Design an enzyme around this catalytic site. Structure first.
Site, PDB file in Angstrom:
ATOM      1  CG  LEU B  12      -1.199   2.546  -9.183  1.00 33.79           C
ATOM      2  CD1 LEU B  12       0.200   2.221  -9.666  1.00 33.79           C
ATOM      3  CD2 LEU B  12      -2.193   1.466  -9.613  1.00 33.79           C
ATOM      4  N   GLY B  13      -1.873   4.045  -4.850  1.00 35.58           N
ATOM      5  CA  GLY B  13      -1.687   4.025  -3.407  1.00 35.58           C
ATOM      6  C   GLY B  13      -1.565   5.427  -2.848  1.00 35.58           C
ATOM      7  CE  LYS B  14      -5.409   6.822  -3.153  1.00 37.59           C
ATOM      8  NZ  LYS B  14      -4.855   5.446  -3.285  1.00 37.59           N
ATOM      9  N   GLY B  15      -0.018   7.728   0.026  1.00 39.16           N
ATOM     10  CA  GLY B  15       1.126   7.725   0.937  1.00 39.16           C
ATOM     11  C   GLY B  15       1.551   9.111   1.379  1.00 39.16           C
ATOM     12  CG  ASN B  16      -1.591  10.625  -3.490  1.00 41.07           C
ATOM     13  OD1 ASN B  16      -1.988   9.708  -2.771  1.00 41.07           O
ATOM     14  ND2 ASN B  16      -2.194  11.811  -3.536  1.00 41.07           N
ATOM     15  CB  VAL B  17       2.048   5.428  -6.101  1.00 38.49           C
ATOM     16  CG1 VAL B  17       2.683   4.753  -7.309  1.00 38.49           C
ATOM     17  CG2 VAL B  17       3.068   5.517  -4.962  1.00 38.49           C
ATOM     18  CE  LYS B  32       6.858   6.888  -2.752  1.00 35.38           C
ATOM     19  NZ  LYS B  32       7.497   5.689  -2.113  1.00 35.38           N
ATOM     20  CG  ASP B 126      12.002  -2.447   6.810  1.00 37.84           C
ATOM     21  OD1 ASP B 126      11.696  -3.283   7.689  1.00 37.84           O
ATOM     22  OD2 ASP B 126      11.255  -1.493   6.501  1.00 37.84           O
TER      23      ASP B 126
HETATM   24  C1  LIG Z   1      -5.385  -0.406  -5.192  1.00 34.14           C
HETATM   25  N1  LIG Z   1      -4.009  -0.501  -5.718  1.00 34.14           N
HETATM   26  C2  LIG Z   1      -3.633  -1.628  -6.364  1.00 34.14           C
HETATM   27  O1  LIG Z   1      -4.380  -2.593  -6.556  1.00 34.14           O
HETATM   28  C3  LIG Z   1      -2.309  -1.628  -6.833  1.00 34.14           C
HETATM   29  C4  LIG Z   1      -1.299  -0.967  -6.124  1.00 34.14           C
HETATM   30  C5  LIG Z   1       0.019  -0.966  -6.600  1.00 34.14           C
HETATM   31  C6  LIG Z   1       0.348  -1.614  -7.796  1.00 34.14           C
HETATM   32  N2  LIG Z   1       1.590  -1.668  -8.330  1.00 34.14           N
HETATM   33  C7  LIG Z   1       2.608  -0.802  -8.098  1.00 34.14           C
HETATM   34  N3  LIG Z   1       3.694  -0.771  -8.879  1.00 34.14           N
HETATM   35  C8  LIG Z   1       4.630   0.125  -8.506  1.00 34.14           C
HETATM   36  C9  LIG Z   1       4.298   0.810  -7.404  1.00 34.14           C
HETATM   37 BR1  LIG Z   1       5.399   2.129  -6.611  1.00 34.14          BR
HETATM   38  S1  LIG Z   1       2.839   0.340  -6.869  1.00 34.14           S
HETATM   39  C10 LIG Z   1      -0.661  -2.277  -8.499  1.00 34.14           C
HETATM   40  C11 LIG Z   1      -1.977  -2.287  -8.022  1.00 34.14           C
END
Ligand SMILES: CNC(=O)c1ccc(Nc2ncc(Br)s2)cc1
Lengths: 43, 266
Positions: B12-15, B16-17, B32, B126
């Protein structure tokens, strides 16, 4: 990427989860967690 | 729990989730994943302990839930509520600015979540669009508690947060309290409606100058109601700032918010 994690199957599962919430306090909040002092020690 | 209790869907996201599904309940959540060795090398173990301690004990519809956590030989895993509409900051960037209905709804949700925190003597410190996610019906979710503190008795000293959102008292090196969140809520409301923060400047010194002078200059398209709320939050003196209950009760919030509380079990 598995079928459940994309497109219509995901949307459906997400909608179903919003309108039929599970008892997260019981299902996850009662299960044991590692002590915060243990997180950087042996698993 | 272990990692094998979950179907991994996608990053979902690179930081990794990762988008994940807990196998026995077919329940979709976010995972996460943090590396133990990296955390130790960077010296952020106690920092992480505190964040987990705070978030894992908060239960509110507008605060991202941490269900549980576990670890193995190399990794720490945080089991988090999945916010299906993703990052609020991305939505703001996409639209440029939000309309009054969208902004008022977010403000009611934010004030409610912050009130919940303050009743437990947790200060967020924040609040900004980048730290907010969106639920299935677009509901605000406070996602991140990176600068947060449980402050039961002592006033605080740490300068923290984000340049454009810093309250005067931090800049001036005074002690601070929970009222810092009230200031940041005002900055947030302004950025929602305008698309830029109110004290935007070419240099950090000029930004600081504008903040401590409360050099607020409202664009002409803003409603009288929205300016009234922002003006009442962005007060130089912390004790003069509109209380969170006051935000929720503000006529502009009442007239424009379309807040919906999510279904609860059961
Ligand atoms: C490319 N990533 C996305 O479109 C995206 C990122 C994050 C997302 N929801 C999240 N929920 C909980 C966390 Br912690 S991230 C839903 C969709």
């Amino acid at each position: 990427i598995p079928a459940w994690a994309s497109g219509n199957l995901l949307t459906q599962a997400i909608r179903q989860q919003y309108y039929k919430p599970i008892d997260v306090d019981r299902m996850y909040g009662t299960i044991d967690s590692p002590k915060l002092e243990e997180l950087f020690n042996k698993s | 729990f272990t990692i094998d209790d979950f179907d991994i869907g996608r990053p979902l996201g690179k930081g990794n989730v990762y988008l994940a599904r807990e196998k026995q309940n077919k329940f979709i959540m976010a995972l996460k994943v943090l590396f133990k060795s990296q955390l130790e090398k960077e010296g952020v173990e106690h920092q992480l302990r505190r964040e987990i301690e705070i978030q894992s004990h908060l239960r509110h519809p507008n605060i991202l839930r941490m269900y549980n956590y576990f670890h193995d030989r190399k990794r720490i895993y945080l089991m988090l509520e999945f916010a299906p509409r993703g990052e609020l900051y991305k939505e703001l960037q996409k639209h440029g600015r939000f309309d009054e209905q969208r902004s008022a709804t977010f403000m009611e949700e934010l004030a409610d979540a912050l009130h919940y925190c303050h009743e437990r003597k947790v200060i967020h410190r924040d609040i900004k669009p980048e730290n907010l996610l969106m639920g299935y019906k677009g509901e605000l979710k406070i996602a991140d508690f990176g600068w947060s503190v449980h402050a039961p008795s002592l006033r605080r000293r740490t300068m923290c947060g984000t340049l454009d959102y810093l309250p005067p008292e931090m800049i001036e090196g005074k002690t601070h309290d929970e009222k810092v969140d009230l200031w940041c809520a005002g900055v947030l409301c302004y950025e929602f409606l305008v698309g830029m923060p109110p004290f935007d400047s070419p240099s950090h010194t000029e930004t600081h100058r504008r903040i401590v002078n409360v050099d607020l200059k409202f664009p002409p398209f803003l409603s009288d109601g929205s300016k009234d709320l922002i003006s009442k939050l962005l007060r130089y003196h912390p004790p003069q700032r509109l209380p969170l209950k006051g935000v929720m009760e503000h006529p502009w919030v009442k007239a424009n918010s379309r807040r919906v509380l999510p279904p609860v079990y059961q």
